[PDB]
Amino acid sequence: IRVRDVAGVEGLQQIVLRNDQGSIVLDALGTAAPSRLAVKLDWSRLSAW
Amino acid sequence: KTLYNYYSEGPSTPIMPHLVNRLRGLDALAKVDATLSKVDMNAAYIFALRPTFPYSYGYKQRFSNRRLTTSALCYARTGLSSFLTVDKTYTSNSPLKGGSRGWPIFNVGVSPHVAEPHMRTLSPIGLEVFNLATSQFSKTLLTASSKVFTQSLYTADILSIFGEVFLPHVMQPVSNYTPILVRALLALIHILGSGSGNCSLSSSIFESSIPQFLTISHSTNMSNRTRYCLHTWSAYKDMFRNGIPPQSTFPPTLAPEGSSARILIPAALVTSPMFPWLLVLVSSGPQFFLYSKDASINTVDIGSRGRITSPIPDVAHLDLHRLWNLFRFDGYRYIDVVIVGVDRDYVWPYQNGVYVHGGKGPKGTDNYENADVHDGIGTIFSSFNNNVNVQTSDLLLGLSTLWNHITTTYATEEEVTMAIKIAAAFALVYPVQPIVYSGCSRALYNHTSYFQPSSENCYTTDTAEVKSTWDTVELSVQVNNAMVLGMTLPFGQPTVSSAQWFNNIDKAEISMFKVGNLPLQNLDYLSLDMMEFYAPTTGQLYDIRSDSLISSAHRTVNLGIGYTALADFFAYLASVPAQSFYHNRMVTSPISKQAYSVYERFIERFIDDFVGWGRCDLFNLDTLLGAKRIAGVASSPIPWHCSLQRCPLPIIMHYTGLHFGQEHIRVRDVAGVEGLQQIVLRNDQGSIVLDALGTAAPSRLAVKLDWSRLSAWYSDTTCAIPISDRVMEIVNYAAIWDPTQERRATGFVYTYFSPNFLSSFNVSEPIFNKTINLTPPYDDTSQTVIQNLSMPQMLSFDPYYESTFYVVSADNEWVPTSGPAWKVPYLENVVKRSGRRLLAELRIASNNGSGDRTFLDD
Amino acid sequence: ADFFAYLASVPAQSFYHNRMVTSPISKQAYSVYERFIERFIDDFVGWGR
Amino acid sequence: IRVRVEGLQQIVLRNDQGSIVLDALGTAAPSRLAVKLDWSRLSAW
Amino acid sequence: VSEPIFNKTINLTPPYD
């Protein structure tokens, strides 16, 4: 379980949705779920997930 | 570098060099990316003008078994972002919750000092004129070189009308654009609003966000206007003898109103959006008043537990002033605007019905003969007309364009830096400091003159949730006047001037005393640069953030908050009591002027060491010593033991490096009497009456030799403030013993912030719109215990002479060297970027795929 | 200029009669495009852009 | 008997209305230990 | 005052009383 304070945006991804008029509608932060290959190379990723 | 380096560094023994070096380092860290007011205006504005200061909070108690908050997270902000008043057309007298009857005016004068002009390079035409004027002639009657003698000293027949008009300036080419840059920074910050979002005297009404729509109001009485005349170049030069207008027009600084200044602008630059902002920012102000278009949408009321009520109960009878309305600037009173290169049928592209001297006339005729004088900037371009609704982005577009043009073409890095530092002195506005008072223990009732608990200037208006017991201010007329008179700027100066607009009568009251002064902008430099007689300085910025108005404004607000924090630190070191800044500062104990005599030394040394401007323009005692005093407002019975402190403690720790962590709370068992003193009182019969234990408060010299003593002093004397009752836990065990007081026993003072205001700290950005949750969902400690963000007790109740005083045991069971028995609030600064700030950083640093920065990187 | 507008992703519709009332993409596109234009003008023409 | 550098103290007292009522200079009477270590201090006293 | 100009806005009163 992670308790980090975060000040540098490492590991973060911007999630954007835009309508047909070109205007942004969501613009939310997000973290990427690990792939099964990633856990195959490092099983602790599954524990973190 | 914010933490790790700076948050792990504490104060050093020579404290002024340490504080100045830290402030320089923090200014280098103040970074809002310039390519952010491109994709998201509002987020960039919020980041620039309303910074956050994250910190962690906790409490400690010795024998509790109750959970209590341990590592909470909060975001501390300072300042008024706008001002709430009764509307102009309120004919009633019933008090309105949050609506002040009037507002302060922070009147700024014209400095007697002149910004030092640095050297400039001439353009090819200026160089031609210089070479002509320095050439060798025979001065015979055959050529025109004799006309300087046969016609007049001021003849154009050798250097043209232009080289003749600009001859003194091309003999010695210099310029300085600091005054206009200062006015630009101030206009941006005052229109948008720095601070915490608080927008009232009520400490609980908050402005939802940066306003989106503004409305302009004219006032003949309050406004500080400039008179304008419009001429074509041909018409302007035809009103002087043999043509040839005067060479220099810069007036003496003591008499800017004596003559008429002129500005020479080519026809190409007139249509620029920066031109009306050029006429503003160099004139007197405010020439018009700015209000939020609708107060119901952008104002909220925050309860003591964080509940947000969007429509506050008296929206329809309130006006939300911008800080623009609270400041008054002195500049030029008469300005001639001369357009160069237009025909005799020239038409003023802005406001209709305005005819340029020598342009198109009212009847459709050309070569208009009258030089009409227009009173105020609003009588020309209609974008500043009365009752005009505008969106703030279009209003500030011209300001941003002006800043970029001047800084990238005419100014230098030194001018921009100096303008930022000067503007910081006027960038923030704070309310009168609220303080509470613990009272003293019943066991010491006969040895005190301050037995009962009390509070001063604690005003809240939320009725949705339960109100804190310390907030008992009733906003009557006299109290409203006193609280307005207590409001201060970052260096602590209050204002004596104020305005008032209700019923249907518009009235202003300006005093001779001024909060400060700004230098005049020399219009000759502007004319020379727009007429292209000086070479541009385009390659002399060296910084980045200087070409952008918004990044510079962020630097200015950061510096201004730093000024406030350092001023509070200095007031603590100088032992300046909070009451020395209230409305009745001049009629209470003589300690006020004595404290000023030390406070001024601290501020003057800081300003000389860091800013570099003339000190008297940025801080002086005139408004402090010119206090008016309201008769019908008696002061609360509180001892003068707490310092000035307009900022919460975490901000002060950010700017000074003070450490107030949990490691300073003492839990010793005590078996040997080390560090203890016996406090004895005897009556005239020789019998003992008190015989109490006590610990000696540290002297300022002791903390100067060891700054950790100050951290320990905070732990030994601070208690968490309760919500529902006026019984602080500390008074059950401890009291102050002051031999310099006739009755030696007192309680504790504790600068106050109120739970409503503290709930605004629960969100990482100051946006409050009924979808934000300010209530801590899994911690109920704040339901009964308020954070204590006050600076500790003052360490000296006499500005000049040092006398030891003590914390004594009031109950005879608690031993002072054992440690506190109450709840002790430790603190720590934390580096933490908000989610909104991280999203913006991803936009402009990892998802920025603009064509430039890819293809024009070479 | 056409090549720059392509490299700067300046849409064709940002030069129509209704370029201001259609989308906020237009102002951003102008901001990007003017940099290419000024850089070229200074590098080649030498006159004041 | 003295007839003519700084071993004195400024003694301050204030009342409830923040007003200084004494603001006077004073000098400390010697302790009996000081008299024991220097008997001329009693003569000065 | 630094200059011999005295009309109406000049403050000739002694500073800080």
Short mmCIF file of N, CA, C and O in Angstrom, two decimals, chain B residues 302-356:
data_model
loop_
_atom_site.label_atom_id
_atom_site.label_comp_id
_atom_site.label_asym_id
_atom_site.label_seq_id
_atom_site.Cartn_x
_atom_site.Cartn_y
_atom_site.Cartn_z
N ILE B 302 -18.77 29.28 3.69
CA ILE B 302 -18.22 28.02 4.18
C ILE B 302 -18.51 27.92 5.67
O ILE B 302 -18.16 28.82 6.44
N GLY B 303 -19.13 26.81 6.08
CA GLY B 303 -19.41 26.59 7.48
C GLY B 303 -18.19 26.14 8.26
O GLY B 303 -17.14 25.84 7.71
N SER B 304 -18.37 26.08 9.58
CA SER B 304 -17.27 25.71 10.47
C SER B 304 -16.81 24.27 10.27
O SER B 304 -15.70 23.92 10.69
N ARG B 305 -17.64 23.42 9.66
CA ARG B 305 -17.27 22.05 9.37
C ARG B 305 -17.04 21.80 7.89
O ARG B 305 -16.94 20.65 7.47
N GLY B 306 -16.96 22.86 7.09
CA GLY B 306 -16.63 22.73 5.69
C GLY B 306 -17.80 22.66 4.73
O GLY B 306 -17.58 22.38 3.55
N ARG B 307 -19.02 22.90 5.19
CA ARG B 307 -20.18 22.87 4.31
C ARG B 307 -20.25 24.14 3.47
O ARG B 307 -20.11 25.25 4.00
N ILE B 308 -20.48 23.98 2.17
CA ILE B 308 -20.48 25.09 1.23
C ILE B 308 -21.92 25.46 0.90
O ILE B 308 -22.70 24.61 0.45
N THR B 309 -22.27 26.72 1.14
CA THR B 309 -23.56 27.27 0.75
C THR B 309 -23.31 28.29 -0.36
O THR B 309 -22.68 29.32 -0.12
N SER B 310 -23.79 27.99 -1.57
CA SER B 310 -23.45 28.85 -2.71
C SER B 310 -24.21 30.16 -2.68
O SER B 310 -23.58 31.23 -2.61
N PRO B 311 -25.56 30.18 -2.71
CA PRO B 311 -26.24 31.48 -2.63
C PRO B 311 -26.25 32.00 -1.20
O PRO B 311 -27.02 31.51 -0.37
N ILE B 312 -25.41 32.98 -0.90
CA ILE B 312 -25.33 33.52 0.45
C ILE B 312 -26.59 34.36 0.68
O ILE B 312 -27.17 34.87 -0.29
N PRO B 313 -27.04 34.53 1.93
CA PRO B 313 -28.43 34.97 2.15
C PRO B 313 -28.76 36.35 1.61
O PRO B 313 -29.95 36.64 1.41
N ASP B 314 -27.78 37.22 1.38
CA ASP B 314 -28.05 38.59 0.96
C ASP B 314 -27.29 38.92 -0.33
O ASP B 314 -26.65 39.96 -0.44
N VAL B 315 -27.38 38.03 -1.32
CA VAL B 315 -26.65 38.23 -2.57
C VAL B 315 -27.13 39.49 -3.29
O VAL B 315 -26.33 40.29 -3.77
N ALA B 316 -28.45 39.68 -3.37
CA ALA B 316 -29.01 40.68 -4.26
C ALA B 316 -28.71 42.11 -3.82
O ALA B 316 -28.89 43.03 -4.62
N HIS B 317 -28.27 42.31 -2.59
CA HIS B 317 -27.99 43.65 -2.07
C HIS B 317 -26.51 43.90 -1.87
O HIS B 317 -26.13 44.81 -1.12
N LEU B 318 -25.65 43.11 -2.51
CA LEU B 318 -24.21 43.22 -2.32
C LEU B 318 -23.52 43.44 -3.65
O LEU B 318 -23.96 42.96 -4.70
N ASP B 319 -22.41 44.17 -3.60
CA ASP B 319 -21.53 44.39 -4.74
C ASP B 319 -20.16 43.82 -4.40
O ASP B 319 -19.66 44.03 -3.29
N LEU B 320 -19.58 43.09 -5.34
CA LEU B 320 -18.28 42.47 -5.15
C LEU B 320 -17.23 43.31 -5.87
O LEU B 320 -17.04 43.18 -7.08
N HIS B 321 -16.55 44.18 -5.12
CA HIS B 321 -15.47 44.97 -5.70
C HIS B 321 -14.25 44.09 -5.97
O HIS B 321 -13.96 43.15 -5.23
N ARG B 322 -13.52 44.43 -7.02
CA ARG B 322 -12.18 43.92 -7.19
C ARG B 322 -11.21 44.79 -6.40
O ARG B 322 -11.53 45.92 -6.03
N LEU B 323 -10.01 44.26 -6.15
CA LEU B 323 -9.00 45.03 -5.44
C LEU B 323 -8.62 46.29 -6.20
O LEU B 323 -8.08 47.22 -5.62
N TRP B 324 -8.92 46.32 -7.50
CA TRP B 324 -8.76 47.51 -8.33
C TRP B 324 -9.42 48.72 -7.69
O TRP B 324 -8.88 49.83 -7.74
N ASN B 325 -10.60 48.53 -7.10
CA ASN B 325 -11.34 49.64 -6.51
C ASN B 325 -10.74 50.12 -5.19
O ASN B 325 -11.02 51.25 -4.78
N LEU B 326 -9.93 49.30 -4.53
CA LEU B 326 -9.40 49.62 -3.22
C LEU B 326 -8.08 50.38 -3.27
O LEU B 326 -7.59 50.81 -2.22
N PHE B 327 -7.50 50.55 -4.45
CA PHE B 327 -6.23 51.24 -4.60
C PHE B 327 -6.44 52.53 -5.38
O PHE B 327 -7.31 52.62 -6.26
N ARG B 328 -5.64 53.54 -5.05
CA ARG B 328 -5.71 54.85 -5.69
C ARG B 328 -4.30 55.28 -6.04
O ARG B 328 -3.44 55.36 -5.16
N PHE B 329 -4.05 55.56 -7.31
CA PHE B 329 -2.73 55.92 -7.79
C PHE B 329 -2.71 57.36 -8.26
O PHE B 329 -3.69 57.87 -8.81
N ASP B 330 -1.58 58.02 -8.06
CA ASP B 330 -1.35 59.37 -8.55
C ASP B 330 -0.38 59.31 -9.72
O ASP B 330 0.68 58.69 -9.61
N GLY B 331 -0.74 59.93 -10.82
CA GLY B 331 0.09 59.97 -12.01
C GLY B 331 -0.07 61.30 -12.68
O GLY B 331 -0.25 62.33 -12.03
N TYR B 332 -0.01 61.29 -14.01
CA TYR B 332 -0.23 62.51 -14.77
C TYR B 332 -1.70 62.92 -14.68
O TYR B 332 -2.59 62.07 -14.62
N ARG B 333 -1.94 64.23 -14.66
CA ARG B 333 -3.29 64.77 -14.64
C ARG B 333 -3.75 65.26 -16.00
O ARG B 333 -4.95 65.23 -16.28
N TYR B 334 -2.83 65.72 -16.84
CA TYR B 334 -3.12 66.16 -18.19
C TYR B 334 -2.15 65.48 -19.13
O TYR B 334 -0.94 65.54 -18.92
N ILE B 335 -2.67 64.83 -20.17
CA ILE B 335 -1.85 64.13 -21.14
C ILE B 335 -2.31 64.53 -22.54
O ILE B 335 -3.51 64.53 -22.83
N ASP B 336 -1.35 64.88 -23.39
CA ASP B 336 -1.60 65.11 -24.80
C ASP B 336 -1.24 63.85 -25.57
O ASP B 336 -0.12 63.33 -25.45
N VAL B 337 -2.18 63.34 -26.35
CA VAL B 337 -1.96 62.18 -27.20
C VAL B 337 -1.86 62.67 -28.63
O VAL B 337 -2.80 63.27 -29.16
N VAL B 338 -0.71 62.44 -29.25
CA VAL B 338 -0.40 62.96 -30.58
C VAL B 338 -0.20 61.77 -31.50
O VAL B 338 0.76 61.00 -31.34
N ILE B 339 -1.08 61.61 -32.48
CA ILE B 339 -0.95 60.56 -33.48
C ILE B 339 -0.14 61.09 -34.65
O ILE B 339 -0.38 62.20 -35.13
N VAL B 340 0.83 60.30 -35.09
CA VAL B 340 1.80 60.73 -36.09
C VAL B 340 1.54 59.95 -37.38
O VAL B 340 1.60 58.72 -37.39
N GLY B 341 1.25 60.67 -38.45
CA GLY B 341 1.07 60.08 -39.76
C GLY B 341 -0.35 59.88 -40.22
O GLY B 341 -0.61 58.91 -40.94
N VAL B 342 -1.28 60.75 -39.83
CA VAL B 342 -2.67 60.61 -40.23
C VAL B 342 -3.10 61.86 -40.99
O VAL B 342 -2.54 62.95 -40.83
N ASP B 343 -4.12 61.69 -41.83
CA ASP B 343 -4.65 62.77 -42.64
C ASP B 343 -5.54 63.69 -41.81
O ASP B 343 -5.82 63.44 -40.64
N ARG B 344 -5.99 64.77 -42.45
CA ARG B 344 -6.87 65.74 -41.81
C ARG B 344 -8.30 65.22 -41.64
O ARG B 344 -9.10 65.89 -40.98
N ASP B 345 -8.63 64.08 -42.23
CA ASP B 345 -9.92 63.43 -42.01
C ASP B 345 -9.78 62.20 -41.12
O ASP B 345 -10.56 61.25 -41.24
N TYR B 346 -8.80 62.20 -40.22
CA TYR B 346 -8.62 61.07 -39.32
C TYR B 346 -9.81 60.94 -38.38
O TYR B 346 -10.38 61.94 -37.93
N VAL B 347 -10.19 59.70 -38.10
CA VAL B 347 -11.34 59.40 -37.26
C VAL B 347 -10.87 58.58 -36.07
O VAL B 347 -10.16 57.58 -36.25
N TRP B 348 -11.23 59.01 -34.87
CA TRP B 348 -10.94 58.28 -33.64
C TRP B 348 -11.62 56.92 -33.70
O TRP B 348 -12.84 56.83 -33.59
N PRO B 349 -10.85 55.84 -33.89
CA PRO B 349 -11.48 54.52 -34.10
C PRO B 349 -12.27 54.04 -32.91
O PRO B 349 -13.24 53.29 -33.07
N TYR B 350 -11.87 54.45 -31.72
CA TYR B 350 -12.57 54.20 -30.47
C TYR B 350 -13.72 55.19 -30.33
O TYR B 350 -14.18 55.73 -31.34
N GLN B 351 -14.19 55.42 -29.11
CA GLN B 351 -15.47 56.05 -28.80
C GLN B 351 -15.96 57.08 -29.82
O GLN B 351 -15.23 58.00 -30.20
N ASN B 352 -17.20 56.91 -30.26
CA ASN B 352 -17.82 57.82 -31.21
C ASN B 352 -18.12 59.16 -30.55
O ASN B 352 -18.26 59.27 -29.33
N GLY B 353 -18.23 60.20 -31.37
CA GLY B 353 -18.41 61.54 -30.87
C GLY B 353 -17.14 62.18 -30.34
O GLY B 353 -17.22 63.24 -29.71
N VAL B 354 -15.99 61.57 -30.57
CA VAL B 354 -14.70 62.10 -30.16
C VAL B 354 -13.95 62.52 -31.41
O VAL B 354 -13.76 61.72 -32.33
N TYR B 355 -13.52 63.78 -31.45
CA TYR B 355 -12.89 64.36 -32.63
C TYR B 355 -11.48 64.79 -32.29
O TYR B 355 -11.26 65.57 -31.37
N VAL B 356 -10.52 64.26 -33.03
CA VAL B 356 -9.12 64.59 -32.85
C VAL B 356 -8.86 65.98 -33.40
O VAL B 356 -9.38 66.36 -34.45
#
